Paper text:
ExoT targets the adaptor molecules, CT10 Regulator of Kinase (CRK) and CRK-like (CRKL) and its activity leads to severe changes in cell morphology, presumably by rearrangement of the actin cytoskeleton. We co-expressed 14-3-3β with either ExoSE379A,E381A or ExoTwt ART domains in Escherichia coli (for details, see the Supplementary Methods section). We determined the structure of the 14-3-3β:ExoT heterotetramer in complex with STO1101; however, the model could not be refined beyond ~3.80 Å resolution. The 14-3-3β complexes of ExoS and ExoT looked very similar overall, and the STO1101-bound ART domains alone (C chains) aligned with a root mean square deviation of 0.97 Å.31Fig. Our crystal structures revealed an extensive interface between 14-3-3 and the ExoS and ExoT ART domains.
Collectively, our results indicate that 14-3-3 proteins act as exotoxin chaperones rather than activators.
Numbering used by the authors:
A (entry chain A), C (entry chain A): 3 to 70, 76 to 232
B (entry chain C), D (entry chain C): 234 to 431
The structure:
């Protein structure tokens, strides 16, 4: 398969809403060992997200009914979903660590992937237990704050990747570490650093960034009420 | 319409003649140059103070406004999205618009692309940053203070993409011309690819 | 697994929106060899439908792009979807013919299943080619008209199963046989036989039946314009 | 309120006294029995002909309507959904309602559960079939022709679930009381399980 044939087949599974195909689809273009443009960089992330978010929306419901007469076989069924996500993230984290993280020649994608890698460490940290429960979070903040200084010292404040990295980080503290103290602490800092420099917006994604900011202001106040 | 061009030279004189040959190329008329110059800076604060409040126009200001709005269709748009700015002494005509919706001023929309004149230009109450094309690049006729100005129309509708308030309490805001909208200024799928909480 | 444990696990895959699990889930309660109540009768049909309709919505898009420079590997990808549906319907048609059709003690379900069996013969008739193309349609009208006389001579006119069987039949002629002459011919007959007897409505599904009638009137006129 | 009960015996006499002990049990009052009987059949065609057209009431008819609407809260509802019927000489107050929406008459809604009186009752122009509870089971007070009647209020809103026209051109229609709505009368998931085209 040519480096461009899979592009079409990858776009197919998306429009066909067959992202499990899109999973292995964009998996191959990165297994080519060559850097991928933002076009493909977007598709792969869009692929695995919709897949993981799908199992996520599936798992999150079971974890509400069992809490809310046998329910062991319900946990046993929830376990096979846990088994699915665990298999997914750790699979994609190797794809991050093998062909994505080092190939990051461009400084922009140097933050998108690390943000994504921390997300999939943030994803796995929910269904985990004991051994991985503490371990997954260690690399989570590791990869998170790692890209943050890059976003801090190199990236513009009002930049889509930087602002998104701050949100997912602010969500990681409130959700994972259940520490809204530092969660709210990191958003305002990022939020404040954004409004002071409004001339830092790019017309290419001027509207794209504002939406992100509209979310953080709707998380600070939300957490403080 | 030379009669309009005479209207300013019958009511302002050397003031109106201050701007005239301010034109390498000339997409605008003789009457269009003097009119835009008269507004820009500085005979304009009362052109909007009278437009707003629905109040009645003066003799000369009516001669200006009509010459001004006329040049708009004769000027706009082209060619890509620009990044103007505008600060105020508080109370801007966009504080009542819900976030995500579209609203238009009564008066005009003088702006600047220089972030320094953005913070500010009497005063530092409410600061904005705009996007569009239908603005008149007057960064040649009247650049007092080197403001490099671009001026939009009046009833032109703006999309309040963001409205927050500063730590020191200066309300910085983002805007966007109505006729852009939707996916006008979005990274092609960069958003979907970030993955978020929401 | 008890005949009632799978009920809960079947309801799980539905709420979890994991119908591929729901496929094999309700597959087992019917493999029990005992008759299934309408509650379970509804779930299984709801299960395989959402699955088949999902692949259907997937396949129908590819069959628009290829029609609308290589596209062989696109047909090759469309083929694996064809392979999916073929595997599905013929699998469920055996489940119909083995544990569903004979177990039909109740006269009501005697029409629901045959209607469904003709549907899955109607489903397979689209992706087929040559050998099965003509063969699948033979049992399609067979099972269809078979339940129709049952619906005609035994079922009330304004009955949900009867009115639905007429619609899917009217859609089968216009879509499959591409013969809107008899398609429109069968709907009006059924439609007319419905409005004359309005006292034939049951309060249990009085609103459910009206919706069906609202569809046929929106297919006759549609086909005649 | 005996004074109301006297209102009919001061204005109808032996007519009003025709109905009185028509009551094994008595969820209704003396004045409620005679009033409902006076409408039902047959002193009622002009109670609605005057309600509709917004026209003014007569002496006695005002004494009826007020006694009638009063008994409604005193009667409705209970206990499950019923299946009344109603045909007309054309022009029913539901021909302007869009299919799927809710509309209410001006006058009242006399009905029957017998499909024969359904087709018809002067005339066979427009035929309907209703569903609800807030109807007054008067199938005891006045069953002229053995109609077994159930009567709903006036401004009670009905959901036009279907509106078609017959081969011979008699518009048969389905209706449903507003306060039922949504999944009031749906086979539990039988619909989703049919699978259709749409
Ligand atoms: O009075 C008004 O119409 C709004 C106040 C206002 N006027 C002006 S003129 C000018 C600017 C400006 C402004 O920001 N506000 C920025 C560059 C040149
Ligand atoms: O005049 C009206 O209010 C509607 C016409 C009408 N009246 C009556 S009375 C009655 C019925 C009826 C009707 O169907 N229409 C059916 C059983 C007893």
């Amino acid at each position: 398969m040519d480096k461009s044939e899979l592009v079409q087949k990858a776009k197919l599974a998306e429009q066909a809403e067959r992202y499990d195909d899109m999973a292995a689809a964009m998996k191959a273009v990165t297994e080519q060992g060559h850097e991928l443009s933002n076009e493909e960089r977007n598709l792969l992330s869009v692929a695995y997200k919709n897949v993981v978010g799908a199992r996520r929306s599936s798992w999150r419901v079971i974890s509400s009914i069992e809490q809310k007469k046998k329910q062991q076989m319900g946990k046993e069924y929830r376990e096979k979903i846990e088994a699915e996500l665990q298999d997914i993230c750790n699979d994609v984290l190797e794809l991050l660590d093998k062909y994505l993280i080092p190939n990051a020649t461009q400084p922009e994608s140097k933050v998108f992937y690390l943000k994504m890698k921390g997300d999939y460490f943030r994803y796995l940290s929910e269904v985990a237990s004991g051994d991985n429960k503490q371990t997954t979070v260690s690399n989570s903040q590791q990869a998170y704050q790692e890209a943050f200084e890059i976003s801090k010292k190199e990236m513009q404040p009002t930049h889509p990747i930087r602002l998104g990295l701050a949100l997912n980080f602010s969500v990681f503290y409130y959700e994972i570490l259940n520490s809204p103290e530092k969660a709210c602490s990191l958003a305002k800092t990022a939020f404040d650093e954004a409004i002071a420099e409004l001339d830092t917006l790019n017309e290419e994604s001027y509207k794209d960034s504002t939406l992100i900011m509209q979310l953080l202001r709707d998380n600070l106040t939300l957490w403080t009420s | 319409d030379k009669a309009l061009a005479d209207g300013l030279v019958e009511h302002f004189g050397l003031e109106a003649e201050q701007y005239l040959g301010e034109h390498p190329d000339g997409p605008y008329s003789d009457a269009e140059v003097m009119a835009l110059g008269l507004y820009t800076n500085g005979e304009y604060q009362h052109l909007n103070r009278s437009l707003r409040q629905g109040r009645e126009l003066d003799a000369g200001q009516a001669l200006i406004d009509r010459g001004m709005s006329a040049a708009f269709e004769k000027s706009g748009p082209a060619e890509q999205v620009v990044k103007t700015f505008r600060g105020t002494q508080g109370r801007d005509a966009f504080e009542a618009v819900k976030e995500g919706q579209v609203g238009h001023d009564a008066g005009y929309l003088s702006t600047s692309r220089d972030p320094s004149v953005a913070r500010s230009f009497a005063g530092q109450g409410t600061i904005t940053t705009l996007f569009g094309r239908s603005g008149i690049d007057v960064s040649e006729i009247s650049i007092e203070g080197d403001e490099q100005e671009i001026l939009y129309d009046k009833g032109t509708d703006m999309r309040v993409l963001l409205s927050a308030k500063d730590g020191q309490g200066v309300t910085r805001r983002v805007l966007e011309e109505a006729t852009l909208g939707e996916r006008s200024g979005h990274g092609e799928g960069l958003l979907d690819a970030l993955d978020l909480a929401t």
